[PDB]
């Protein structure tokens, strides 16, 4: 299986437009990564991480994005906050894993790197595995916004300010969420 295309990948999408990759028809070894001791965060919900690749699922999805350390605690079952409510939400019945590592050396930049965006405004919260690219002018006042920014009419996406001399809580982190789908279909992803 081509995990190197997801983890050791060159470019990562920002969290508002996170990147889902489908994985099927290959043999995967999980214990290469968990015992690699290369990630700062590796939490698996549902299945035991300890050598339980003795299963076969229909499909395997890998969702990659970039956030900050303060927000890593939000990529977890039943968590609430900016990222979970407005950017990327996981369901309570999560049969999967979340991995994350500090990418301060690759996503920061002197004077700030403002290439990663996060959604700061939304009328409702995101359903599990929803994805919102709507750059509609969020309405915070009584006036309808009519697509133009102005008094009480803010753009929904806002930049990350990734200076390298940040505290760890403010530094960029790369996150990959693995979901294991077992539907009523021929299972092909075994170990």
């Amino acid at each position: 299986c081509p995990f190197g295309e997801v983890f050791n990948a060159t470019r990562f999408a920002s969290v508002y437009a996170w990147n889902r990759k489908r994985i099927s028809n290959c043999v995967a070894d999980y214990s290469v990564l968990y015992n690699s001791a290369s990630f700062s965060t590796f939490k698996c919900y549902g299945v035991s991480p300890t050598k339980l690749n003795d299963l076969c699922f229909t499909n395997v999805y890998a969702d990659s994005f970039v956030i900050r350390g303060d927000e890593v605690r939000q990529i977890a079952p039943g968590q609430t906050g900016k990222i979970a409510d407005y950017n990327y939400k996981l369901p309570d019945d999560f049969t999967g894993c979340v991995i994350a590592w500090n990418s301060n050396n690759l996503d920061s930049k002197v004077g700030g790197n403002y290439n990663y965006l996060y959604r700061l405004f939304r009328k409702s919260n995101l359903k599990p595995f929803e994805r919102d690219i709507s750059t509609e002018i969020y309405q915070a006042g009584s006036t309808p916004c009519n697509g133009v920014e102005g008094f009480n009419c803010y753009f929904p996406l806002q930049s990350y300010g990734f200076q390298p001399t940040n505290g760890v809580g403010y530094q960029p982190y790369r996150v990959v969420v693995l979901s294991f789908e077992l539907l009523h279909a021929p299972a092909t992803v075994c170990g």
Partner: antibody
Amino acid sequence: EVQLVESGGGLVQPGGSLRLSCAASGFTFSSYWMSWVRQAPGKGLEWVANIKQDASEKYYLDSLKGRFTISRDNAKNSLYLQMNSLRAEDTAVYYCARDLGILWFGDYPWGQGTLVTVSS
Amino acid sequence: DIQMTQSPSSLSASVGDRVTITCRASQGISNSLAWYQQKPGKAPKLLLYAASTLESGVPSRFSGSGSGTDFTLTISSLQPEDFATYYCQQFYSTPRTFGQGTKVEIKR
């Protein structure tokens, strides 16, 4: 990190003026409004001024009666507040905040305001 | 213009207690309300916005509910660092207006 640094507070006599500055860094200064919020001696937050991204719109508290003028220079990532005809009641710690309706104040330790003390 | 009123203005509680602060507006403002924490002498810090969503970096013990004219801020298990004054603001119109604040004290 959102770093907002206030400067310019001091002792002014009643009727005098003062000009406060707010140096900003850690975010795109052009994408946000900017607000000035003061806090009197042990008396809680009172929003006083608001300036747009391109500074084409400015909003104030009518209590101030046109004594205050908000300004911003984007090239310098800087916000300014000109306080004219100062009254004793203007004695307060003044903070600048990044604005999108919501106020983000300066992260620790950078953001901590400047103290205006108006007295005869 | 829009008036904000906080309750109970001064609240005494203990560590590990569950704490709720109430904030009401003189007119409806949908969910365009935010909650801030200020420790003595320091600058205010944004805890919650849009009535319910936690700003990143805030401990998950802080949560907010409400809409229309009624809002509640809730800390699940009070910790020693949570004793401070709390303010609510609205970003529905100008002038931007704060609540008078409620001081959270230590119960003895």
